Amino acid sequence: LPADYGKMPAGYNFLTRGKDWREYDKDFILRTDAVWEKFQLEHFFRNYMKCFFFDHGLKKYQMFEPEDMYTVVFEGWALDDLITFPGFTPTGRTNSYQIGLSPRQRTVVPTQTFYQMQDYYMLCGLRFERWFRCDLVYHDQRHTKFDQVKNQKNYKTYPCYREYYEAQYACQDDMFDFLMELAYARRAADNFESDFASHELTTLPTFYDTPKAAERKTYTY
Amino acid sequence: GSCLLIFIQLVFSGIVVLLLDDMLNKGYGLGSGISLFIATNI
Amino acid sequence: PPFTEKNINDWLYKTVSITGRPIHGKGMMIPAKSYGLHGFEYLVPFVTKENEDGSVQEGLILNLGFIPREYAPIWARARVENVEEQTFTCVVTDGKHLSEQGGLFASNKPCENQWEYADLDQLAKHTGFVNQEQVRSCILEHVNTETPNDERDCRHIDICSDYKEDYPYKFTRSGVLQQPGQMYWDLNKSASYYSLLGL
Amino acid sequence: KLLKQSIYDQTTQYKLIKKNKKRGELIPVTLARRILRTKKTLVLPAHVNIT
Amino acid sequence: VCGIYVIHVIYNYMIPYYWVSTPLKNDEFTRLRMKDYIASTVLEEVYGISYAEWGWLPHDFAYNRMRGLAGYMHPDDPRAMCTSTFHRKHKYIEHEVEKVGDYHHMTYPK
Amino acid sequence: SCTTRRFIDEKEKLEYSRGYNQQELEASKLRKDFVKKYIVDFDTTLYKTQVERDWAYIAKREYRYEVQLKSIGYGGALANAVLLWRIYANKKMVFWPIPIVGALGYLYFQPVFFQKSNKRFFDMCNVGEEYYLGRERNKILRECNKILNVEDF
Amino acid sequence: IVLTWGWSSFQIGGYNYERFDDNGERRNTLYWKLSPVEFPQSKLWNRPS
Amino acid sequence: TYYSTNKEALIQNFEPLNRKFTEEEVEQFLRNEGRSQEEKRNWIYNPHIHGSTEGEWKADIHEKFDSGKAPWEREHVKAKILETNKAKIDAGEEIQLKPFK
Amino acid sequence: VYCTVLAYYGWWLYDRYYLFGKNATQDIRKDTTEVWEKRAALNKRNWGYNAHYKPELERSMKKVLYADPNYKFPIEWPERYMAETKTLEQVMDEEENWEYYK
Amino acid sequence: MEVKYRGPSDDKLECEFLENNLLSCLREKSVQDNVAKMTCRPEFLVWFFLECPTKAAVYHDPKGLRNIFIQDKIKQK
Amino acid sequence: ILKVARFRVLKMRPKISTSYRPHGKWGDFLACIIPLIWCINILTNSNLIL
Amino acid sequence: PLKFWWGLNKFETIQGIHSILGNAADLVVSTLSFIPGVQGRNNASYIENSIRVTRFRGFD
Amino acid sequence: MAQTAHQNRYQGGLCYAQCNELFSFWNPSIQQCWKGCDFGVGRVNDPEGRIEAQQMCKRWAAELYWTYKGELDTIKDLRVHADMYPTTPQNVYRACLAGVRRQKF
Amino acid sequence: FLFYNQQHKTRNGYFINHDNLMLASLEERKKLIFYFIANQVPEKLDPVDRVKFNEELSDNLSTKARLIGSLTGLIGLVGFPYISTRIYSRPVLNIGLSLLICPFLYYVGNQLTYSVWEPKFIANNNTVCELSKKYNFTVFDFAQAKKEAHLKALRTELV
Amino acid sequence: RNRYWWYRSLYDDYVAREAKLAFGIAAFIWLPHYYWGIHLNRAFEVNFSHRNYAHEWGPRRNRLAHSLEFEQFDMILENWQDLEDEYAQRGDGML
Amino acid sequence: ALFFMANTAISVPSVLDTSPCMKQMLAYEDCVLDANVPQQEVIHPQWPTIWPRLLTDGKLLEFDKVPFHPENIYNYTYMRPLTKKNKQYLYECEEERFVFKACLRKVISLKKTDKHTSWDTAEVANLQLT
Ligand SMILES: CCCCCCCCCCCCCCCCCC(=O)OC[C@H](COP(=O)([O-])OCC[N+](C)(C)C)OC(=O)CCCCCCCCCCCCCCCCC
What we know:
part of a larger assembly, 16 chains, B: mainly alpha, binds 1,2-diacyl-SN-glycero-3-phosphocholine, Cytochrome c oxidase polypeptide II (chain K)
């Protein structure tokens, strides 16, 4: 083997034109039913990825939204909202892949604070309160230092994006609208919660309430 | 012990014999139970 | 069509390819069994010529093939049947074993769709076609001519094992040749059995 | 599975299905939908998790 | 038995509900996690998978194994902890999995 | 599927009813010899690969239900007929017709049900050319194709 | 009435349904290895529930 | 179940050596007295008794002894096996390289 | 004796739960180093890390390339599931200035 | 999945559409897509071999393909 | 049922029930084993689907 | 089944019986060695003696 | 321990006990620590096996959460504390590494 | 014992071990090793050599032993009726007596003809000497063949 | 066990004769149920096997068909390019 | 519970995959995944001919796309030509690509003829009965 084995030769076009394919016959095995199975392949594809129908008036492929059997059969003459078929992929490649769960995202306000309850209402309130604190810090700087800048040169992600998306996930739009009304009522008056909070004076002491908070944690490899 | 020496007399090593010796002991014991089961039936 | 009561022996059991429009509304279901399935032979009035009003029609009887018992009623199907002009390649057939399958203590009830055997005159009357003699002459069995012509093929309807075809299932060229239960090997076996019983 | 050009009157077909459609005793729920019909479908993927 | 069950419920579900009722300055998430953990995570869950063969056939067990590995993917879940592993073969017979830890993806059993 | 199984059963019944030619008989003999040896006369759990063991056991179970159990049932029916005849003749209970006539019925019906379903068992061994069982089945299949002047799967 | 009918009728019904009606399969399907199985009868009709 | 599993493993995965040990394999066996157990042997190169060069000799020694690679895993030994037993290669008998253990 | 057996079982469960560290420490000292090393070797699994292509084809070039101890993959396995943190222009520039080993 | 069976359509208009797409793709890819505007849709190529077996067999046949190429060249001038 | 339908009516061998009160040996224990098994079954199944 | 007298070989009495029969047959052959075609018994060959005396050696 | 190798934490051995001792009882990081114990079974004693196990921890953290290419390579402090929760890929990586460190044999 | 079959222990050179080889000459050692390998592990030989050795062994030891055992069993069947009278016949008893006598005499005759002719066949056969020179097995080959023979006997006992 | 203990355990009432006669009949009434349940369990297992295959190898076969069609196009394209080369040689004599 | 189902059908095996060139397809896909190429069109072995612009400029669409605007790196992946590193690590997967293409061409060369008498009962040979 030459010392350059595996190195792509200069000007390699990846072209198989005029190539002898009779040398690879010993590198694969086809069973006796390969001819039959091939047809089956085609059959399945022709009846599985064909969610579109050719139209003679337009002479092109069209489609509609998923419909029940009764509507497809006994209302085939009365079809509404026909859209020209655009293709599964823009470049014509295959898209038939088995999918899975994508990696999760970082959590600022954990769901485990209120996870015994299937209904997320206290969690919704907590997440919205945290986002509202962050927003009260940054709400008026958004159009000059953050997402709403005129030019992309000074573009920066809004610091409360993750908390906002967590609050949106935890709350329905109705409860989110209620909390946004409260947020407007408290941002018009610039009511930071620290201006009124005193309940820490009437709360039981805890090991986490030590004056030396940085030295309470023991770090270990 | 005795089977170990017997199987080492045949071309074998001490480690390999133990694996082979166990199988014969298990097989002979199974036959003894089969003989014991046959005696109870008849 | 050239088929007639007098010329039928010229066209009997002969492959034609005729264009016309089938009437799935008035289809007759002759009881039959195919590969252990109790289903029906699906006869339809095949309209070849008709006037614009549609009151006067003439045609033939077309055996569309075997249709299972579950899907015999029109409301049981997930399709709206096509009754426009279609071309069907069919073997002209007398329709003999269908007319001799009722057995004793069996009779057809027309004026309703109740059939036990293919009584040609009653089927012709049910069709309502004007050319009664030609309709009574024969029936055209929907066949697939891309199949072996031997009677030993043992695939009588054009299907696969998985039944991936669509009902009704048309006949193969061996299916048309096949008389159910009266082939020469069956009669030879019966003759041998009765000779053994007698001697 | 072809969007052909209809030679019938589609309104007449719709009104004839509305007026008098053939039914039977053992008719599947697929072919007999009278209270379970909507104008939109909620489409979701299969073999995956949706909250 | 009913009294023991009721006392167990009130011990970890009713009374701990009153521990935190106001926003907390220090380690609020820690305290809320403590309260929730002593309630959300129960012992029975582990058995619910430790004897999964009592109703899951081999192939259904394989499919539910991949499904459970997907559904308990999130790390911040104390209920996933104290739950018997899905990285296991079916006790009766295993078809898909040849070895416990021979995968091509970390978070997928194949 | 149930439809596939019923079609296979009824087609086998029709083939046995019409007859079995001569070259068809030779091919059937080759297929039956291969199936008998490699499935009935061999422990299907002794194959090297898991695919071979699984599908050979599936073929053996099919043989057990379609040949062994069917032949046992038909031989038992024949033995029951002879037993009823002998009970009526002797006007008392007898036991001899059960073992002897049952064995004779099994020996009469096992070849019949094996000849009827030889192709079914032969095809179920088509695990592939990568395995020993598949290679042997493919060799026998090529011989049968030479005999019958056709191509099978 | 009490024993024989309540312990054999449904099994007979399912066996006849599979033997004759092919378990009510819609036969116009492509690939058995890729198709759902039409199960035999499993809900007993001879029990009150 | 240990007995059943071991019996299945033995029956499935046991074949006779099916070949005569080659000259190279026998020579390696006779030189296996040079193998040291629990402590690696210090291989010293003497050109008048070993020949070749120091690098090539040390590479061959590492292949033969230190690497643990068996004689039947050497390419030239495999070629000799497939050449000297071609009569058994014919008639559809496959030669087994590593003896069963 | 039924009450005594039930009490013993309950105490065993309590001790197993509460003295897990002590029990595991005692169990780790019941076998010598060699036995534990053998057990650890038997339980060694890849768990899906670095599960790159394993060439089964005999003429595959990547077979010889992987046998080479100096072969560099285009990206490290743990980095195959991490989002890129540099601009597309930088990525294309680095890839176009990239040079193959050997 | 319960996928029903329907054989290749061989519809005149559908196969004309698919064959026009195939000819466009052949003309585009024969010059490594050096055209000013490329109208080829690769996905429809797949369907040409799933629903037009007659035209696919014609295209595979060397004489039929030669005739098709000659006619296309005449059309393109 | 057979007994009470065939041999417990007055004209078919009735019994002189002379027992004032019942004296049982772990009665409910035998009457609660069958239900408890059911409970187990149900619980297990639910957990799996949950 | 039929083959268990072979398993009876472990007893030293059976081995002695076999040795007596074999030696008597060897004497018969040696006295008949004058007839052409019979090899006879040679007492100067190691192989013959080793096969004779070690046949039942190490029996288990 | 749905993501780990053992049905119960007691089969993990001394490594799982040390993982339990590392974090508070309500901290889900323990499970991640357990995965470290799984990655360094036959690898901790081998000098390159330890690096392989650390790479396995990095891959595991990258698969659980969305991560950036340099993110796990610029962690200033790899030490863990009792109240460290697996809310970030950095925390998952740190817990997994701590579990790897505590795998004797 | 009754549990296992031990007809192969004292036949076809199964009893050859290293003690038979330590005292043998180089040529005698080669002959003994080849005989043991050919009888116990025929796979080590080419198929033509296997056929030749089987033919040379059958007409001298195997088939001759079968015939001698058959003759000695026929010696034990001078009268097949054995116990038999006009009043009563004993078919099952006579069959049992035959199955107890004839196998025993067969075993005795077979062991005798192996005890007499096997050493002479090993030491005075031209085919054995020629094939031993052709193959020229070593002590390592004999050790491997001994292991293979024991493992094959174990496998046969298992099945 | 203890006959007296087991003959009055059920609330001092005696149903032991019917309990004894119950085993013999109950030993056979469960056979049809058991065999049909075996059939149903096998059907469920086959359906789960089909679900696994369709989930895993379902998408893969569609890609294989896609590649088969692309390869047919590739063969046609090679022949078309050969024709283009011939037409480049014979500028207009080919037509 | 313990034996509530009273039986488990362990005899029925996993559905055997009998696709013509599935093994070669999976080998080629694994090899291409090793190359770590952003373009997905490389999944098909015919990419040099179907999308030749992958080797010249990467313009695979004539501005008839809907992947959103080029604001992040994960945009216009098919509109990105193969770099030198991608080309090298794809060339390393050339033999498996060739074997896959040869298998596809041989399968295409297979035609249904009149000697396939077992076509109507090909399911049994395909091993669909368990
Ligand atoms: C929880 C408890 C439930 C049951 C409690 C009791 C209440 C219900 C009592 C029902 C009583 C029986 C009613 C049905 C009677 C007919 C049986 C039937 O059709 O079953 C359907 C079953 C099933 O029929 P099938 O095969 O059509 O199944 C249905 C199939 N599908 C669903 C697919 C459409 O049929 C049989 O079982 C037929 C065989 C048995 C026939 C028995 C006839 C002989 C009767 C002897 C009586 C006793 C001896 C008398 C001697 C006299 C001497 C002088």
